[PDB]
């Protein structure tokens, strides 16, 4: 699957171009535009006229091609998700968060629901340790997604 340069309209006006195949996703698609432009993953929001583009789906199941122009927008407040949180235990949870929230939210959350300390346990996400001050939206959470309680 040969290479073609996409283009992709920033609503307001400009408009950019990025090297795609046939056979990416959208989540490789808007991690190429956060590697061109900055705007991190989870705050893309793709539309192709007016189509809703979803995570997961491949560029030629759109059909859409090196003439078609995708409108991108930022979510600069995303609805709610639900994630799960194991413990050593193994016992998933059900929390509520927003993506554009700082990790040490939810270290209260759960500090407050299981009586732990904020700093006696820490979080990690397929196997990589949440900062304290970073948004959780830079980890890649999906919906549903296990977040992993130690110590």
């Given at each position: 699957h040969?290479?073609?340069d996409l283009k992709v309209k920033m609503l307001g006006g400009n408009d950019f171009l990025v090297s795609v195949t046939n056979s990416m996703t959208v989540s490789?698609?808007?991690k190429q535009i956060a590697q061109k432009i900055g705007v991190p993953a989870f705050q893309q929001r793709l539309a192709h006229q007016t189509a809703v583009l979803?995570?997961?789906l491949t560029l030629s199941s759109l059909g859409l091609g090196p003439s078609?122009?995708?409108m991108l927008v930022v979510q600069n407040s995303s609805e709610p998700l639900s994630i799960l949180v194991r413990n050593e235990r193994g016992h998933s949870n059900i929390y509520e968060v927003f993506l554009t929230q700082t990790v040490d939210t939810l270290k209260k959350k759960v500090s407050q629901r299981e009586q732990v300390h904020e700093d006696q346990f820490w979080l990690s996400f397929e196997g990589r340790p949440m900062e304290d001050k970073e948004l959780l939206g830079e980890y890649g959470l999906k919906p549903q997604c296990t977040v992993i309680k130690h110590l």
């Open positions: 040969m290479a073609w490789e698609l808007k979803q995570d997961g078609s122009t995708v």
